[PDB]
Design a protein around this ligand. Sequence first.
Ligand SMILES: *C(=O)c1ccc(-c2ccc(C(=O)OCC)cn2)nc1
Ligand SMILES: *NNC(=O)c1ccc(-c2ccc(C(N)=O)cn2)nc1
Ligand SMILES: CC(C)c1ccccc1
Ligand SMILES: CC(C)c1ccccc1
Length: 9
Amino acid sequence: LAAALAQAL
Ligand SMILES: *C(=O)c1ccc(-c2ccc(C(=O)OCC)cn2)nc1
Ligand SMILES: *NNC(=O)c1ccc(-c2ccc(C(N)=O)cn2)nc1
Ligand SMILES: CC(C)c1ccccc1
Ligand SMILES: CC(C)c1ccccc1
């Protein structure tokens, strides 16, 4: 999940 969100940055 971290990756899925972190892609914003
Ligand atoms: C949420 O975005 C997310 C993405 C990817 C993973 C994840 C966990 C483990 C591996 C892996 O190859 O482990 C080898 C032991 C790959 N991707 N978790 C959460
Ligand atoms: N929000 N985006 C990021 O923080 C981000 C981190 C890392 C990367 C990225 C891109 C390309 C490579 C590579 N060619 O190995 C590695 N990491 N993009 C975005
Ligand atoms: C620039 C756009 C894609 C954005 C990225 C992160 C946070 C807010 C907007
Ligand atoms: C440089 C551009 C393609 C970008 C990369 C990662 C996150 C937001 C924009």
